[PDB]
Amino acid sequence: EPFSLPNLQTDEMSSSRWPNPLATLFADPNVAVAPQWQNGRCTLEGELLGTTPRNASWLNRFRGVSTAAVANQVLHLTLYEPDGSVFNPLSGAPAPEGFPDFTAQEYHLRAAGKVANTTGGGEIKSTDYTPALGGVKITAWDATGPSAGVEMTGQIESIGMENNTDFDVLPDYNGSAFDGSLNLAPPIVPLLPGETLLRFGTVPITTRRQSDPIRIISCALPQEWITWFLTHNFTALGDAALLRYRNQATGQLLFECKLYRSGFVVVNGVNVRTEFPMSGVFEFVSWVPNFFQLAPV
Amino acid sequence: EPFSLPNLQTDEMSSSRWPNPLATLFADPNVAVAPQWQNGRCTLEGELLGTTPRNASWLNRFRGVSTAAVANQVLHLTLYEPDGSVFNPLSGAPAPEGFPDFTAQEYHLRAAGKVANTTGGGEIKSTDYTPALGGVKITAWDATGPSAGVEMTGQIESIGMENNTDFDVLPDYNGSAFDGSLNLAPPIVPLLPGETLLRFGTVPITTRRQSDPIRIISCALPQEWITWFLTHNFTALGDAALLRYRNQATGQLLFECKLYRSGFVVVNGVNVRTEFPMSGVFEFVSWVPNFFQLAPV
Numbered sequence: 001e002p003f004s005l006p007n008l009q010t011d012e013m014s015s016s017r018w019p020n021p022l023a024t025l026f027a028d029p030n031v032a033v034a035p036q037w038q039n040g041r042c043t044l045e046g047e048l049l050g051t052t053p054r055n056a057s058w059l060n061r062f063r064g065v066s067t068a069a070v071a072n073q074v075l076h077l078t079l080y081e082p083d084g085s086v087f088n089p090l091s092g093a094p095a096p097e098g099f100p101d102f103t104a105q106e107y108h109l110r111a112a113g114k115v116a117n118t119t120g121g122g123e124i125k126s127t128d129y130t131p132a133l134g135g136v137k138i139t140a141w142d143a144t145g146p147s148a149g150v151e152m153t154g155q156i157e158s159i160g161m162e163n164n165t166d167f168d169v170l171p172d173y174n175g176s177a178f179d180g181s182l183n184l185a186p187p188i189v190p191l192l193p194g195e196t197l198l199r200f201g202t203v204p205i206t207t208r209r210q211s212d213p214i215r216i217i218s219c220a221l222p223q224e225w226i227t228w229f230l231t232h233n234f235t236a237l238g239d240a241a242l243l244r245y246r247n248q249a250t251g252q253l254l255f256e257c258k259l260y261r262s263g264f265v266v267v268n269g270v271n272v273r274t275e276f277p278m279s280g281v282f283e284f285v286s287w288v289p290n291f292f293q294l295a296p297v
Numbered sequence: 298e299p300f301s302l303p304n305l306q307t308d309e310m311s312s313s314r315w316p317n318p319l320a321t322l323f324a325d326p327n328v329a330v331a332p333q334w335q336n337g338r339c340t341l342e343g344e345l346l347g348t349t350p351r352n353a354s355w356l357n358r359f360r361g362v363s364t365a366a367v368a369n370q371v372l373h374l375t376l377y378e379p380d381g382s383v384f385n386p387l388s389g390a391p392a393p394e395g396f397p398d399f400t401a402q403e404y405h406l407r408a409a410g411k412v413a414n415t416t417g418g419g420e421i422k423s424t425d426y427t428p429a430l431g432g433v434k435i436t437a438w439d440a441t442g443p444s445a446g447v448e449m450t451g452q453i454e455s456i457g458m459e460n461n462t463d464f465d466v467l468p469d470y471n472g473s474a475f476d477g478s479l480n481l482a483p484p485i486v487p488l489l490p491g492e493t494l495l496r497f498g499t500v501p502i503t504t505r506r507q508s509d510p511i512r513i514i515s516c517a518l519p520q521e522w523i524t525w526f527l528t529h530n531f532t533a534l535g536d537a538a539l540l541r542y543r544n545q546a547t548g549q550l551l552f553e554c555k556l557y558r559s560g561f562v563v564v565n566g567v568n569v570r571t572e573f574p575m576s577g578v579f580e581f582v583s584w585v586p587n588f589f590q591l592a593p594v
């Protein structure tokens with residue numbers, strides 16, 4: 001069981017922060033504030049951080065129970081965890097596992113329960129996106145049911161998203177203008193100053209794009225790497241795994257990079273935002289210390 | 298290189314025919330006809346069958362280019378494959394990789410382009426679901442764009458589904474009842490007479506549930522097993538892998554089953570629809586011939 005990464009090209013993998021195929025691979029050295037994503041977080045030893053779900057397909061999924069019958073297009077849900085246990089809002093988690101970890105003007109959804117007139121679409125407005133409190137108020141809900149006390153399961157499908165930069169802004173999970181009562185995974189910061197976070201990007205469907213249509217949400221690890229770490233017994237024999245990104249078809253080595261053991265990748269010598277080809281495969285080379293300096297891209 | 302399966306519980310894995318977590322594990326010996334699913338199909342040696350996408354997150358996604366500007370809530374797309382190449386209708390494929398492989402009244406979707414005024418919702422009516430012909434007519438499309446010539450990407454999110462048995466009926470991909478020119482993965486049939494297909498089930502969101510409200514779509518392999526077969530170079534050393542399904546928490550061996558090398562699981566001795574616990578893990582035991590007789594559940 002020596003360390004390895006799966007043999008998948010970047011374009012054959014999926015985002016761990018929005019369910020969709022990876023579409024871009026890039027480093028942007030001019031980002032002013034480090035991201036503090038709560039999904040897509042996993043150590044190389046397979047320990048999940050933040051709200052990262054153990055089951056890949058619980059990302060952007062939710063379940064709960066109606067607290068009241070639908071009225072005036074409002075559906076209020078008391079939230080459960082994926083495993084159907086009750087989400088305890090006095091415990092300090094920001095949200096059930098897999099809930100969105102960024103700021104949006106609304107989160108559009110679909111949901112359904114065990115009876116027929118409970119399939120509907122709706123949305124959570126930003127001011128209602130307070131899942132740390134243990135429930136969510138869904139508005140613009142367009143089904144006639146459920147009545148009270150009914151299990152509902154659903155999916156967040158798209159967002160109203162005026163600024164692309166808000167994908168890196170944590171939401172006000174407890175509605176309290178941000179508290180240090182929540183258990184949040186720490187910011188993602190390269191351990192050497194010339195290093196830049198390598199971002200795995202995908203395109204979510206969003207509205208509110210009228211004047212700026214490009215939307216890109218980034219993550220630290222492909223979902224398939226998170227599952228790889230969960231299904232292997234890896235021991236980090238070093239601070240960081242030195243990787244090479246290779247076009248396996250043409251043989252061309254594109255760059256070397258460091259996969260830090262807390263679960264993110266960096267490159268060295270990036271002076272402007274730089275995109276990389278998507279048809280490459282990251283291959284493990286060897287274990288290196290944190291102070292190891294990479295060949296510049 | 299020795300055959301294995303990932304150490305995930307069934308409820309920690311995902312459907313390969315509808316993007317959602319697995320919710321049921323069951324065998325039904327009284328299903329009228331054998332399924333001929335085109336997604337979720339992969340041999341143990343990692344050969345994808347049917348329309349099964351290589352990238353997990355391509356399932357239920359589509360990409361194409363608008364044929365004309367939106368008018369009267371109609372958007373017609375000429376279809377592409379996931380890799381952005383043009384889908385070739387002469388090739389014999391029934392649809393681009395990842396397209397739905399079952400009959401429904403409507404396929405509800407959301408889509409968006411790189412430019413403003415292109416985020417919308419819509420649906421493909423059954424009579425318009427003829428992707429083998431190389432395009433799809435989306436109706437009830439609610440955005441003002443796109444114009445002609447614009448690349449659109451989207452996701453099928455729910456279906457109108459009056460009859461649950463239609464999940465096991467292939468759609469009329471080319472607009473007719475005649476599928477002889479189409480390269481279809483074969484029907485899934487156990488090789489020994491008392492065997493029953495073991496179905497991995499999830500709940501899709503559907504409308505039209507007034508007759509029968511329970512909706513369950515089944516698949517032959519969890520998506521994480523398909524990716525496992527792609528990322529390992531297994532050789533099939535016998536006709537079937539004998540597996541044991543074990544509750545790893547308690548230790549109770551629940552049943553043994555056969556994973557045939559063409560990519561599906563059977564159990565023996567099921568005489569009525571039988572559901573099984575979701576908290577177990579499948580473990581490889583040994584390679585066995587087609588006629589190896591399992592201990593009955």
Ligand SMILES: C[C@@H]1O[C@@H](O)[C@@H](O)[C@H](O)[C@@H]1O
Nearest residue numbers: 106123140159160207208
């Ligand atoms: C109810 C509103 O409807 C449209 O304006 C969408 O663009 C917004 O995201 C919001 O959902």
Ligand SMILES: C[C@@H]1O[C@@H](O)[C@@H](O)[C@H](O)[C@@H]1O
Nearest residue numbers: 403420437456457504505
């Ligand atoms: C146009 C129709 O609208 C509603 O009746 C849905 O329940 C149907 O599935 C279809 O989408």
